[PDB]
Design a protein around this nucleic acid. Structure first.
Lengths: 41, 63
RNA sequence: GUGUAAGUGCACAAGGGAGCUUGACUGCGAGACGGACAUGUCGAGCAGGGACGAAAGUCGGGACUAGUGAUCCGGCACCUCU
RNA sequence: CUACAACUUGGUAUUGGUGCUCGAUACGGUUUGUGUAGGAUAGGUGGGAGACUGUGAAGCUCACACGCCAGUGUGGGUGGAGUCGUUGUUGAAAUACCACUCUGAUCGUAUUGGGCCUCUAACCUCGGACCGUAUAUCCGGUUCAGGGACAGUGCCUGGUGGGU
RNA sequence: CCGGUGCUGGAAGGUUAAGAGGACCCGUUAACUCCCUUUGGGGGUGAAGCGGAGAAUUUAAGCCCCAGUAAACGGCGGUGGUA
RNA sequence: ACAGGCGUAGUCGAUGGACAACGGGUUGAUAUUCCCGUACCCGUGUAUGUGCGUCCAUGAUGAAUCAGCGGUACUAACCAUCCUGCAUGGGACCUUCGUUGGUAGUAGUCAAGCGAUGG
RNA sequence: UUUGAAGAAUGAGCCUGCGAGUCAGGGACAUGUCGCGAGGUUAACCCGGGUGGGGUAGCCGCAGCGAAAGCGAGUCUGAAUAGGGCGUAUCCACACAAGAGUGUGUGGUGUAGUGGUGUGUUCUGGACCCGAAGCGGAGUGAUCUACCCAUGGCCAGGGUGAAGCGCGGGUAAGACCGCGUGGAGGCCCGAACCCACUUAGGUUGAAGACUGAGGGGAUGAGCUGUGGGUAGGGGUGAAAGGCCAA
RNA sequence: GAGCCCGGUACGUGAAAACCCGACGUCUGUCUUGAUGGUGUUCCCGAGUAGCAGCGGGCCCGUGGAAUCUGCUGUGAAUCUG
RNA sequence: GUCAACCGAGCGUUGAUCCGAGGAUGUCCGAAUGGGGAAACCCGGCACGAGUGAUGUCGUGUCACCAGGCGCUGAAUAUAUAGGCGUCUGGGGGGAACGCGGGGAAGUGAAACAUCUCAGUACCCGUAGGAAGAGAAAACAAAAUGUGAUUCCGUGAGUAGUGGCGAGCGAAAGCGGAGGAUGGCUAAACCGUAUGCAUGUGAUACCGGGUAGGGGUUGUGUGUGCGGGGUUGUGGGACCUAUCUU
């Protein structure tokens, strides 16, 4: 799902990078540990 | 198994039709998954039953 | 002897041979036979367009009687239908 | 005979990461083009009379490829001032420059699937330890130890099926 | 006695579902093109879009296939001559 | 799916465990139940008497300080092995651990009696 | 009920009561009867203390032919006035045609439906009445019986004499052999107890499975009490299609 | 076998209290910081929804060329020139 | 009171018996609810009273579970939560028919039978109310310059259709009636406010302009709540922007 990055994640991008991710990845790794949040405004 | 703890989605009932058109009763169950949700950012995890549509809608907070 | 059972016929030939040909038609059909009904059977004659024949005329398959399967459902071609 | 239970196959959702290994097309593309009229293995249409050159061209020696080993290309070395043209061939020009590419082995960018080795965070554990708890081989939670995107489950799907 | 039917093991091939794939074709009409008549209908071509039927290709178990197994279910012969 | 199925803690459930009474007499009908004689088992109150304990006291004890010395071993060093350096082993320094003179059987704890829902 | 039964085919002891073509629907067809008549009639509903009044929505007649577009006393098929099919109430008169059966026209004549209700059939309803073995759904049962679980009880009397142990013989030591002790066993005989092999009786029984004589087991895979569990396509079964309240 | 015997009948009358219907009030909310008809543009108009696909249900419609409605499973839009 | 009298005792003009309304009492069981239990019978805790020399005993209240509020505490463990404690308000069960939503037969008919019928019936589950359900067009309709929420009744119609095109099943549009409320409220765009969570050029920033301050009506975001405002099809509404103004 669409989201931007909060911290540095390897093979994805830098902070603030808008990357396209699979729902499993974003729901189970990035969002729960706060490495990213969804794109609203 | 057949009832979602979130939206109340339940099994439907219908018939199973063979080539000879013999109709037999069968059920249509929802795609109910056991998901450890995080109700509050404190971190308490509880095992709940959610349909895959509820997971899709972000309604179950599996944080 | 008549393609093929048997029968009724056929030497006037319906039996044998040759020439041309596609009526093994289209729209029909007075009148009948047989029949519980459904089936089935014969049919002169009229029109179109043809075959053969000098012509008269004959030809809506085969000497005749078996060679077949209702309805439903679906396929194909055409129609100035919806 | 027709069904169904149960068992079983695959797809898909739950369901994620990184790497290797394969296949398709797209883009910068190399590349392959043997009638014969012949300097001669003309792909045609083009803007098409002058271009590459010293970001070192003719003449030679190497590597590889194919090889119709005809010979061509790339890479490097050698050399140091050339090939070329309507050159005359022709439907069709020059292999003098530039503007997509067609018969073909390739590459770097995409996408897309197939397989494999892994990783952990989904998910699972009737493995341990704590807590709810005074009493609890229930249950739930926390945590450690393991599996692990498999399994289980939903939907779709093919088999087996006197078990009914 | 492993020929038959089961069971166990193995896939080198043949066949094979769903799912992926969507060539090709068809319907509709923006646009044109022919008419044929006069107080606009009658023929053809037909982009895109939206639809309908959809082919080649890919794909598992099973079956076919290759073996083993009878204290598995089962089976275990005739004819002629000759001292 | 629902109706419901299981089941933990509990709580019931004798056919079992624990638990104090015998002989005689009597009525028209009851009797280890009533009566007679003699028992035993749980409680309650009063009075009396020994004889313990808190308050009082006496015992029983034991914990902790500083300071006095040897072995672990912050770390630098020595010996020896291993491949300038290296890791190992071993002696000791610092802290630390252990022994003992003052302290602190003084403050401390206990000593009637009940006693588990626990062992 | 039968081809046929006085009966040796069926049923009926007797009497008195009771016991079998009904109802609904503007249903369908036919036929009476009544009203109106090229028209007839309302349904729901509204208003009347009634059985009365209103209510035009519909329905049936009023034109047919054709698959239909459609045309229409015609229409369909067909190239066809060229025949056929269906339709133009029916009759009468007059003509013109034909004697392949009669037709084609011109005048008259003029066409009858519909709504109540009776009756007979009929449709859908249990449909004239009576009569199964069985099939589904939901419940009730293991106080009988089958097996299992917990906890108790019972088995007179008499035999036989395993292992083990001891002593003695024997041997290098044993094996082994005698004598004792011992008291085993889905052991033996036999009452209670549990069965049910034979026979006789009973057979409108004392009894909806018994009685009398005999018979089997009888320390065990025994019998039995109390409490409990398993439920119908299910249970349980040392297996007989047995048992699960005659 | 009763209009004139009795209970009654036609017809009149009757509620302390409770309850039920009305009505008028206290009470409450509410508008008055208000209203009208005009001019050219950005934003909003109900999302895991509609639609689509697979398997079903039900509609006169038994899967049929099968619309409208609906269950489960996947995928998944636009806000009015929608 | 009566069967249903026979007595025996008594009441009533100071109004009985009798009839209506409202109160009081109301053992035990039963949803049964302090705990248990083989319903109607066993054993209690707490508080306050009575009684006894004291124990025994008696009377009156109260003590189930779950759900939802409020308050206190906050395990493993840190944030915290699960849980625990206290206190308030509900629920539980019964009932003939009618309602709504789910699940769902078979006998039967088709002269067999499986699609089909029976029949969405019987039955079952969950839930009501005095009725329920539905209801205010993402509707019909067909070019009529047409109707205008829902429900129910009659027709349309045993029709169009549908069906092993078998047995059978079977609409709607339209039209006539009953009743009428062609009914109401919201969500969003925007404003204002309050707050949670992020931060903050932390100043030239946010009030409607002109003037003067100020470094926060926060400055910016985002989320949520509250109050305005907006309820529409010829589109409507916010944002604007004139004119008119009880």
């Amino acid at each position: 799902m669409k989201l931007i990055l909060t911290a540095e994640v390897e093979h994805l991008g830098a902070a603030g990078d808008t990357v396209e991710v699979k729902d499993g990845y974003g729901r189970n790794y990035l969002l729960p540990r706060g490495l990213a949040i969804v794109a609203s405004r | 198994a057949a009832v979602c703890d979130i939206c109340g989605k339940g099994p439907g009932f219908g018939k199973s039709v063979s080539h000879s058109h013999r109709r037999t009763s069968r059920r249509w169950n929802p795609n109910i998954q056991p998901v450890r949700a995080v109700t509050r950012p404190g971190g308490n995890k509880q095992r709940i039953n959610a349909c895959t549509s509820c997971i899709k809608a972000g309604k179950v907070s599996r944080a």
